[PDB]
Design an enzyme around this catalytic site. Structure first.
Site, PDB file in Angstrom:
ATOM      1  N   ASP A  15       0.804  -1.218   0.000  1.00 16.33           N
ATOM      2  CA  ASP A  15       0.000   0.000   0.000  1.00 16.33           C
ATOM      3  C   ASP A  15       0.842   1.275   0.000  1.00 16.33           C
ATOM      4  OD1 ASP A  15      -0.945   0.016   3.601  1.00 16.33           O
ATOM      5  OD2 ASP A  15       0.986   0.114   2.623  1.00 16.33           O
ATOM      6  N   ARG A  29       0.832   6.799  -0.120  1.00 13.05           N
ATOM      7  CA  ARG A  29      -0.080   5.834   0.442  1.00 13.05           C
ATOM      8  C   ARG A  29      -1.211   5.660  -0.573  1.00 13.05           C
ATOM      9  NH1 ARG A  29      -3.414   2.509   1.920  1.00 13.05           N
ATOM     10  NH2 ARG A  29      -3.776   1.796   4.068  1.00 13.05           N
ATOM     11  N   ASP A  34      -6.865  -1.035   1.907  1.00 10.26           N
ATOM     12  CA  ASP A  34      -6.091  -1.654   2.964  1.00 10.26           C
ATOM     13  C   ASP A  34      -5.604  -3.020   2.454  1.00 10.26           C
ATOM     14  OD1 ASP A  34      -6.263   0.299   5.026  1.00 10.26           O
ATOM     15  OD2 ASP A  34      -8.193  -0.506   5.668  1.00 10.26           O
ATOM     16  N   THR A  35      -4.307  -3.108   2.425  1.00  7.36           N
ATOM     17  CA  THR A  35      -3.505  -4.246   2.016  1.00  7.36           C
ATOM     18  C   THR A  35      -3.003  -4.974   3.239  1.00  7.36           C
ATOM     19  OG1 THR A  35      -2.402  -4.303  -0.142  1.00  7.36           O
ATOM     20  CG2 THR A  35      -1.035  -3.841   1.748  1.00  7.36           C
ATOM     21  N   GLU A  37      -0.171  -6.259   5.527  1.00 11.94           N
ATOM     22  CA  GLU A  37       1.153  -5.639   5.456  1.00 11.94           C
ATOM     23  C   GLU A  37       2.285  -6.602   5.810  1.00 11.94           C
ATOM     24  OE1 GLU A  37      -0.592  -2.603   8.136  1.00 11.94           O
ATOM     25  OE2 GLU A  37       0.782  -1.223   7.138  1.00 11.94           O
ATOM     26  N   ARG A  81       2.751  11.425   4.035  1.00 18.04           N
ATOM     27  CA  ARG A  81       2.590  10.647   2.812  1.00 18.04           C
ATOM     28  C   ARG A  81       1.576  11.223   1.844  1.00 18.04           C
ATOM     29  NH1 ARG A  81       1.682   5.010   5.686  1.00 18.04           N
ATOM     30  NH2 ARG A  81      -0.206   6.133   6.335  1.00 18.04           N
TER      31      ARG A  81
END
Length: 135
Positions: A15, A29, A34-35, A37, A81
């Site tokens: 992500d 970002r 939502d990945t 992690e 980010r």
């Protein structure tokens, strides 16, 4: 919205990608996703983390051109980010991860939600197809 050019510096995780934008190196970002992690002791290397990370990596590294697309709201988060949709040869990396069941659509903050429905449509399809995370 409009796309601007950027140059890959380094892929960091599913992500996050580090890009040269407007002549400055910057961590982006990926908006609305939502990945799992590879990062954070508060989780560690979660399940499908290495998979989500290799995918984003491959996709940005093999691209002829990278473009960034800011949404309508704030363009950076509290960590400095950039908040964007990232495109590799015209394909949105955020949708691709979601389409492959390698990301879920995040909790959304207006007004940064222009592609939310697009992405929710891809997530529904990946779940139907029971892909990866949806296995």
């Amino acid at each position: 919205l409009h796309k601007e050019p950027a140059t890959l510096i380094k892929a960091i995780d599913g992500d996050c990608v580090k890009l040269m934008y407007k002549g400055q190196p910057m961590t982006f970002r990926l908006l609305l996703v939502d990945t799992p992690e590879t990062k954070h002791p508060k989780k560690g290397v979660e399940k499908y983390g290495p998979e989500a990370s290799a995918f984003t990596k491959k996709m940005v590294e093999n691209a002829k051109k990278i473009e960034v697309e800011f949404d309508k709201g704030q363009r950076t988060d509290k960590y400095g980010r950039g908040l964007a949709y990232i495109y590799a040869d015209g394909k949105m990396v955020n949708e691709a991860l979601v389409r492959q069941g390698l990301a879920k659509v995040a909790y959304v903050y207006k007004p940064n939600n222009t592609h939310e429905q697009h992405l929710r449509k891809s997530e529904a399809q990946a779940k139907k197809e029971k892909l990866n995370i949806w296995s």
